[PDB]
């Protein structure tokens, strides 16, 4: 897990801090994305501690950590960057391609759920593209390994939270589970089918909580298939017990994606 600073070459430019670099492996040279930490040390180490336990094709892999000028978390590079920014710049991306990418995110989330980790920041800015047809989930800084005896994480205080992606129980009871990640996944789907537009446009967090308590939900994005909007609405089931888990979500997306692939061949 501990990398050698001499084997890392960083580029001056800023991706997001997040910088591009190259790391000398056993033989090949690997292009990497590096989170630079310019309490804060413990936070980066806890993110690294989560990433080291994960191994899935739809999750960003951690190469390791390095303590040099600053603490650094070295990851595989997802060359095309965040999904929301990619879709904002590529409005030609087809609905079939969007379904493909959100289905890949659901496969990564089905694995995270099976692994009993809660992501707690699942949003389109935290889905990175390796290619136009390959998405990976990133940004595990708020993530938690669930206790062996519970299916949720209880936050102690309401911090600097991405409220627009949070389920009502996160806001009302501070409870985070794989089902609250499903609610966030519904918002991510809405962002993806909206080509990276921000959700709940022009609304404050308190207005969003009020809207959702009234049983109101964001409308269908232009050109979004009805089956995908119905799945977003299912993710936005108010009551946690009746909301689907990722196995049910991934299955729905998988079958729909096969239907669209079939329609494409016809
Ligand atoms: C906004 C993001 N949620 C910030 N965090 C991360 C994490 N990991 C990466 C990576 N592992 O490629 C990137 C990343 C950002 C980026 C931007 C342009 C091109 C490639 C890029 N890679 N950004």
> From the alpha carbon of 78, which atom of ligand 1 is closest?
12
- Regarding the domain delimited by 78-266, which CATH topology (the fold level of the hierarchy) does it fall under? Transferase(Phosphotransferase); domain 1 (1.10.510)
Pocket of ligand 1 (CB under 6 A): 15-16, 18, 33, 60, 75, 77-79, 81-82, 125-126, 128, 138-139
Half-sphere exposure in the Cβ direction for 143 (13 Å, CA): 28
Tell me if residue 83 falls in helix, strand or coil: helix
Mark residue 136 as left, alpha or beta (left: phi above 0; alpha: psi -120 to 50; beta: remaining). beta
Q: How far apart are CA 151 and CA 175, in angstroms?
A: 10
Answer yes or no: is 131 a known binding residue. Answer: no
Answer yes or no: is 35 a known binding residue. Answer: yes
User: Ligand 1 centroid to 211 CA: how many Å?
Assistant: 32
**Resolution, in Å, please?**
1.5
Residue 160 near residue 52 (C-beta atoms within 8 A): no
> From the alpha carbon of 77, which atom of ligand 1 is closest?
12
Residue 139 near residue 16 (C-beta atoms within 8 A): no
Q: Give, to the nearest 10 degrees, the angle between helix 95-114 and helix 246-265.
A: 150
Domain boundaries, the chain: 1-77, 78-266
Closest CA to 10 of 38, 37, 33: 33
Pick the CATH number of 1-77 from 3.40.50.2300, 3.90.79.10, 3.40.50.720, 3.30.200.20: 3.30.200.20
Q: How far apart are CA 108 and CA 60, in angstroms?
A: 10
- Burial of 148-163, coded b for 16+ CB within 10 Å and e otherwise, reads eeeebbebeeeeebbe
Residue 131 burial (CB < 10 Å; 0-12/13-18/19+)?
A: exposed
Question: Is the Cα dihedral 58, 218, 163, 37 positive or negative?
Answer: positive
Q: How far apart are CA 190 and CA 228, in angstroms?
A: 9
Answer yes or no: is 6 a known binding residue. Answer: no
Catalytic positions are 121
Angle at 76 between CA 88 and CA 5, to 5 degrees: 125
With a CB cutoff of 8 Å and minimum separation 6, the contacts of 197 are: 88, 191, 221
User: Ligand 1 centroid to 231 CA: how many Å?
Assistant: 27
């Amino acid at each position: 897990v501990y990398l050698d600073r001499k084997l890392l070459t960083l580029e001056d430019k800023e991706l997001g801090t997040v910088k591009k670099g190259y790391y000398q492996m056993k033989k090949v040279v690997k292009t990497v994305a590096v989170k630079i930490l310019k309490a804060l040390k413990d936070e980066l180490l806890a993110e690294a501690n989560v990433m080291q336990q994960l191994d899935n094709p739809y999750i960003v892999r951690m190469i390791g950590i390095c303590e040099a000028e600053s603490w650094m978390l070295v990851m595989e590079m997802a060359e095309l960057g965040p999904l929301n920014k990619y879709l904002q710049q590529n409005r030609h991306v087809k609905d079939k391609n969007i379904i493909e990418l959100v289905h890949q995110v659901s496969m990564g989330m089905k694995y995270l759920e099976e692994s009993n980790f809660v992501h707690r920041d699942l949003a389109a800015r935290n889905v990175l593209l390796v290619t136009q047809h390959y998405a990976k989930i990133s940004d595990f800084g708020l993530s938690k390994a669930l206790r062996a005896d519970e299916n949720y994480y209880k936050a102690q205080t309401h911090g600097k939270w991405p409220v627009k992606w949070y389920a009502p129980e996160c806001i009302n009871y501070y409870k985070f589970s794989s089902k609250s990640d499903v609610w966030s996944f519904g918002v991510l789907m809405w962002e993806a089918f909206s080509y990276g537009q921000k959700p709940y446009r022009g609304m404050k967090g308190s207005e969003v909580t009020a809207m959702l308590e009234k049983g109101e939900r964001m409308g269908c994005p232009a050109g979004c298939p009805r089956e995908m909007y119905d799945l977003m609405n299912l993710c936005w089931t108010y009551d946690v017990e009746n909301r689907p888990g990722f196995a049910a979500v991934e299955l729905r997306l998988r079958n729909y994606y096969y239907d669209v692939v079939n329609e494409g061949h016809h």
